[PDB]
A paper describes a structure:
Dual-specificity phosphatases (DUSPs), which are known to remove a phosphate group from both phosphotyrosine and phosphoserine/threonine, constitute a large subfamily of PTPs. DUSP28, also known as VHP, is a member of the subfamily of atypical DUSPs and contains a single catalytic domain, whose precise biological functions and enzymatic characteristics are largely unknown. The DUSP28 monomer adopts a canonical DUSP fold composed of the core region (β1–β5 and α2–α5) and two mid-domain variations: α1' and α1. To the authors' surprise, DUSP28 has an only partially exposed active site pocket and exceptionally low phosphatase activity, which together differentiate this protein from other DUSPs.
Another unique feature of the PTP signature motif of DUSP28 is that the residue immediately preceding the catalytic cysteine is tyrosine, in contrast to all the other human DUSP proteins, which contain a histidine residue at this position. To verify whether substitution of Tyr102 with a canonical histidine residue can cause structural changes to DUSP28 and improve its phosphatase activity, a mutant DUSP28 protein containing the Tyr102His mutation, referred to as DUSP28(Y102H), was prepared and subjected to crystallization. We obtained DUSP28(Y102H) crystals in the nearly the same condition to that of DUSP28 crystals, and its structure was finally determined to 2.4 Å resolution. Although the crystal structure of DUSP28(Y102H) was fairly well matched to that of DUSP28 when superimposed, with an RMSD of 0.50 Å over 147 aligned residues, the Tyr102His substitution was revealed to result in noticeable conformational change of residues Ala33−Ala34 and Gly57−Pro61. These residues are in contact with Tyr102 in the original crystal structure, clearly supporting the structural role of Tyr102 in sustaining the DUSP28 protein fold. Nevertheless, the main chain carbonyl-attracting hydrogen bond is not shown in the DUSP28(Y102H) structure as was in the DUSP28 structure, consistently with the nearly identical dihedral angles of the C103S residue from DUSP28 and DUSP28(Y102H). The phosphatase activity of DUSP28 was rather reduced by the Tyr102His mutation, in contrast to the introduction of the Asn105Ala and Arg107Val double-mutation, which considerably improved the enzymatic activity irrespective of the presence of Tyr102. In conclusion, DUSP28 contains a tyrosine instead of histidine at the position ahead of the active site residue, and this tyrosine may play a structural role. On the other hand, this substitution may not be the key determinant of the atypically low activity of DUSP28.
Numbering used by the authors:
A (entry chain B): 16 to 161
B (entry chain A): 13 to 160
Write the structure that this text describes.
């Protein structure tokens, strides 16, 4: 199975099969799995919670809606001592989008710095152009609250 | 077979469910639910379009550690409500696991005590009864919250 990639402390990214290995996630301390898909089956691991963000890897779909509620869940899981695994089918677009959204919202990065952080961990990271624009709107809105 | 209705309102933007809420997609949409909290290892949730689902994987068993999941669970629920949505917490019987999560959330994010939070749950769902293990964990949670 492909490894999990540690994006940042208590933050992991993976492809779909990487979320199936119960032993990796236990090794990584993963307590919450964010499954950014509509069909991929998520963790079976005893005691690993799962949040499903149901989107196709598709510039039409509205991933912007789910960012703030998904990020709140993840930050809570980390502040309580756990860690998060964000996965999609390829570990390239949807999971990349949520990870950078998390880093902007809770680690106070700009979209550029945050995404450079995801890329360094995961070179193939590439949100489709629709998501990439939704993340700029997230940044816009974050700036205005901040 | 589980006690009806499928959905009960426990508090503004907070609904409890039994298994029969798995086929109540229309009632969900009425109630503007934007997040389902499935508190089971094995139960299915409603297939509500683009509604997020959080699974809190525990059996209705006094040895299951629900306490460990309350913070990300309660945090997801609040963020959905703060965003203007509603939450549906559902378990198979709508009695133990979903009740205890509803109690927890009220304590954590609406500052209610454990006497008042559970009262609201029981009052909306008269059969509600977390198993003794879940009740101990809830008691433990109220102490952690009164200290913090
Ligand atoms: Cl900044
Ligand atoms: Cl890019
Ligand atoms: Cl179950």
């Amino acid at each position: 199975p492909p490894p999990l990639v540690r994006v940042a402390p208590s933050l992991f990214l993976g492809s779909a099969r990487a979320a199936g290995a119960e032993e990796q996630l236990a090794r990584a301390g993963v307590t919450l799995c964010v499954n950014v898909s509509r069909q991929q089956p998520g963790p079976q691991a005893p005691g690993v919670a799962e949040l499903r963000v149901p989107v196709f890897d598709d510039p039409a779909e509205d991933l912007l809606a789910h960012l703030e509620p998904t990020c709140a869940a993840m930050e809570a899981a980390v502040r309580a001592g756990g860690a998060c695994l964000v996965h999609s089918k390829n570990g390239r677009s949807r999971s990349a989008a949520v990870c950078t959204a998390y880093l902007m919202r809770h680690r106070g990065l700009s979209l550029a710095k945050a995404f450079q952080m995801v890329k360094s961990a995961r070179p193939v990271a590439e949100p489709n152009p629709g998501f990439w624009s939704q993340l700029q709107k997230y940044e816009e809105a974050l700036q205005a609250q901040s």
